Amino acid sequence: ALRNKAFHQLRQLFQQHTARWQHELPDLTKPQYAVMRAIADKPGIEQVALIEAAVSTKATLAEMLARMENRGLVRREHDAADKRRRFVWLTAEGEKVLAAAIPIGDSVDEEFLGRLSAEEQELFMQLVRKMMN
Amino acid sequence: ALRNKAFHQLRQLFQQHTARWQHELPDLTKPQYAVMRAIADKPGIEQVALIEAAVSTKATLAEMLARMENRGLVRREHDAADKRRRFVWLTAEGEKVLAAAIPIGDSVDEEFLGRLSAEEQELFMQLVRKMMN
Questions:
Q1: Which long-range contacts (CB under 8 A, 24 or more apart) does A82-87 make?
Q2: End-to-end Cα distance, chain A
Q3: Those residues with Cβ within 8 angstroms of residue A44's Cβ, 6 or more apart along the chain or in another chain
Q4: Is residue B49 a contact partner of residue A39, using CB atoms and an 8 Å limit?
Q5: Domain span at residue A14?
Q6: Is beta strand A74-78 parallel, antiparallel or unpaired with respect to A86-90?
Q7: Does residue B25 fall inside a structural domain?
């Protein structure tokens, strides 16, 4: 049965967590949230570097960041040499939105991680990383 | 950092596995694949029951199954009483497509699960289920 497939149960969990995230933060997706935290950690980060936080393609990030700056959450500047290269900052509003979302996302994570001891959480992470090499 | 968030690393893994799936099976997504296996296990399954395999909403499943029968992969029949209620079978082609995809999907799963011992696989599953209650 599908319940016996590790990666099926994985999509079940990922979707349950995503669905809770959608209910609590309907206007800030997990990829948007992660991108914004990467920007807050490294203001002026090069736009291309943000695909790691976004776990997306260059195209999906382009569409994402365009939507985000149209919503006044981020601003961008270009390289005078190569205007494709772009740098990303949070706007004042973006910082406010991010500040409010962090404890919300943390608590959504906790709805699930809270069902595990500390040793089990650390060990769930070791397994995920081991499967990614 | 985001790498220290269990559910961020989880999306990293899920997307890596999804990206491999997309490369090997570009015409059969994981939700489509899971739905088809649920149909093959229970021919004539009620369409509503398939949201569990699809890990989706009723609407996403509707769009999915419509696309799948337009591609000749599944067929559907209606309840003479309540024609919203529908039953789903695989077509001959669908069975052929599913037969070919199973070993492909299994081997994609193995690219990741293969990096874990049997005890670690079973234990990754116990953790995922424990976080879903």
A1: A85/A46, A85/A47, A85/A48, A86/A46, A86/A47, A87/A44, A87/A45, A87/A46, A87/A47
A2: 28
A3: A77, A87, A88, A89
A4: no
A5: 6-131
A6: antiparallel
A7: yes
Residue A120: burial class (beta carbons within 10 Å; 0-12, 13-18, 19+): middle
How many other C-beta atoms are found inside a 10 Å radius of the C-beta of residue B10?
A: 21
Residues forming beta bridges with residue A88, ordered by sequence position: A45, A76
Is there a domain that residue B1 lies in? no
Helix/strand number for chain B, H first, E second: 6, 3
In chain B, the residue whose alpha carbon lies closest to the alpha carbon of A17 is B7
> Could you give phi then psi for residue B30, rounded to 5 degrees?
-60, -45
Q: What is the resolution of this structure in A?
A: 2.2
What was the elucidation method? X-ray
CATH number for the domain spanning B54: value is: 1.10.10.10
Extract the tokens encoding A6.
């590790």
Partner-chain contact B6 A121, CB within 8 Å: yes
Q: Is the dihedral of CA A19, A25, A31, A33 positive or negative?
A: negative
Ramachandran class of B25: left when φ > 0, alpha when ψ lies in -120 to 50, beta otherwise: beta
Identify whether B33 is part of a domain.
Answer: yes
Please count the structural domains in chain B: 1
Query: Which tokens hold the place of B103?
Result: 């070993």
- Shortest Cα distance from A39 to chain B (angstroms)? 12
A1 in a domain, yes or no? no
Q: Measured between CA atoms, how close is A51 to chain B, in angstroms? A: 11
